[PDB]
Symmetry: C3
Subunit: 282 residues, 3 copies
Amino acid sequence: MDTTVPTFSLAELQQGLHQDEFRRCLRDKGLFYLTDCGLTDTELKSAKDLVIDFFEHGSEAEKRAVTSPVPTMRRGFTGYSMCYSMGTADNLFPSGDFERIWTQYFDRQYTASRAVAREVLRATGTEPDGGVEAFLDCEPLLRFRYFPQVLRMAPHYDLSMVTLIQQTPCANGFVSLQAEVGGAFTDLPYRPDAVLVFCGAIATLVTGGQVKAPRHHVAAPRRDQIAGSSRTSSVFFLRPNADFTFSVPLARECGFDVSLDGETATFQDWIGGNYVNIRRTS
Amino acid sequence: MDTTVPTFSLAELQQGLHQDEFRRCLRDKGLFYLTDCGLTDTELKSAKDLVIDFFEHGSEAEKRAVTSPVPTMRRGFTGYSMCYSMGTADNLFPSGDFERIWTQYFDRQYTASRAVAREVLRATGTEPDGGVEAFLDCEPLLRFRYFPQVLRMAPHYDLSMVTLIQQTPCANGFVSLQAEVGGAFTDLPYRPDAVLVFCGAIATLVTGGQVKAPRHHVAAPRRDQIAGSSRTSSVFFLRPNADFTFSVPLARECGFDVSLDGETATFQDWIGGNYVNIRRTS
Amino acid sequence: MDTTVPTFSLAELQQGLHQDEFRRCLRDKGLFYLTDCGLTDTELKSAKDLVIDFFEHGSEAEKRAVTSPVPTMRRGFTGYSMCYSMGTADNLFPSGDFERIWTQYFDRQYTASRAVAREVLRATGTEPDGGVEAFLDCEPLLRFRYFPQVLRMAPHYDLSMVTLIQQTPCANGFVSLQAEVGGAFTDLPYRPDAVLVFCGAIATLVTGGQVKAPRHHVAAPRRDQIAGSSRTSSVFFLRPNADFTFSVPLARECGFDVSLDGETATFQDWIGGNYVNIRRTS
Ligand SMILES: O=C(O)CCC(=O)C(=O)O
Ligand SMILES: O=C(O)CCC(=O)C(=O)O
Ligand SMILES: O=C(O)CCC(=O)C(=O)O
Ligand SMILES: [Fe+2]
Ligand SMILES: [Fe+2]
Ligand SMILES: [Fe+2]
């Protein structure tokens, strides 16, 4: 195999170009960069600038007013690092300016996520139980995370349908995010023109095993690079509804070690009553 | 904010004094010391002395006779540390003397726990589904843990309604337990006259978000203090029944990242079929 | 107590010999070596040789063709170590030669596992809900794991009915696997003539507390032994069906900290929708 992490334009995919290349990427890799999806570096910088302004300049009192009473990182602020989370509703916003910027940014991401998911399902000939549009009108979670200088994040796969990741780079050039491609870890650097997409385990489940869910982690710099090593990431998880229904025997055929009686099950039956975003192979 | 960990007398709370102070503590802090609740240092020493006598002087055979066949730390003895656990029934007791002392101590703790929980629910105007008394007649767990000298315990929040903690101090004066208060970790030292109460996630859930569940951890001494660094803690978790029922949309409003179809759910639906006492934000 | 890890011949057990010795082993230890069960070193070497030939000599492409799209270690190959997994169906085999050898080896293990489980249930007078044979016609998982040189595996107990383990030895003589026996960790070395059996938590549950589920872990060599320290293990888990049904109050009597409403429950109710193989006491 070529272990190159490919790039696809969403616009060309939506026109039916590169079908074989895409299908083969999904099955053998499960990850790719995505251009022409409505997501520019400019916007990433509008949103990143206002949130980082809050991480740095927001009072204790202002942070408290947008902190959930249980510290789940589902909505609002969570303070060696800081996080800002959002979904389609129940959001906590520091101000009217933040809210316009972050609502627009969320929506752009949720649109791109749905749009690439529709292409994954089309490329694999997949009609989810309940149909495509009800499957994609779901329960996404957006987490933006600022990381200070000196693994960083242990290897896992995602339990999303897809995950979209926009990063800003280490000022000193270190590349933190890596994924397993062809049996070894490959760099996944920042690209101002593109978003990284990871397929998660739900893509594998829904498509009956036609899409890989790759393992990935976040590396630590060599101490020779422990100045200029901070970074941010925007991680958008497209997560199915609780009532997403799948075939139990088909789940079994593609590696899922389910303990489910009977022939069909829901996402809730499988994962339980709280979203679980990531999983270790261990 | 004043980041002082407040103290309340249960007796004054039960007389309706300090209502605003208490409500504001619950919402902004989720933790406090509690005096006048039936829990003296003297008793803590009666119970601690007999169990430590067992940790030290009980035979292998005697420990085996009060060890569960699965090592869950639910009931009896568990052997870098030792634990003694109890609930309302199915207990394992080393002897008739231990049993009287530990039954009385359990009951005192379970009484105080219920009594402070009733005040939390009253201060927030909360009527659990099924009413207050059936909610508080629940499934508590008491764990007493002896820790040897050289984190100790990673940061988490509790999934209890409330947790009551009685500690004995490090002979060398180090303060191991800390909690997040006002965005930073604050010491929670021993107080012979008071118990520490942590609100857990069930308090947040039941009250619709009026109570914080704070993160806390147990620190390690600086090696300059790795003689005289042993300690014990008595941790009493007030845990709801499996059939505790709550509103799904309300859960969502207060930060809980539930994957629950439909409008109501039970504690079992949310957490699954085994009690889970604590959780990481990660 | 004698903290010796005992050995039983399955053939003598099946003839009703050593009943008291076996019962007392199950209750106080939960672990033993097993001879005369159809499992020779010769076979272990037929299977180990072909899989190690694949770990070393199989192409990237060949490994990919027997890698599941989600990296669960349920079936096929998983690449600091490599694993090969199998069950009763949905297997991924590198070739017709591997398949004959591994099918036969699986089946031998599944036979021995069932046969010792039947003896455990008989020795304790246990009739599972739904009867013995439907209980033992279950959902086993076989994992073969090659470990390179420099804990290795953290302490846990198994959630199996029984687990059978065949190891090959460290060329330098170090003994990696240990279990808690009589309150301390005891070596469990390779024995060409025997398999190690661990009782798991399901044995404890089904038998109403007559069998211990011991904790065990895998130790690291002293750096004085970090050449010749690689090893392999074949771990066979006998895991109940999702619909295995047990008594909730009885579960509670033997240490299980269940959050289950009502009087009976299924394995799925307790553990959820994915198999969980092992558990920490923590
Ligand atoms: O921070 C990153 O780039 C990756 C984060 C990630 O994989 C996750 O949150 O799942
Ligand atoms: O040992 C302590 O003081 C705290 C223990 C704790 O937070 C717990 O068991 O949840
Ligand atoms: O590798 C070994 O010998 C033990 C493995 C083990 O206990 C397990 O996979 O549960
Ligand atoms: Fe991830
Ligand atoms: Fe705690
Ligand atoms: Fe194990």
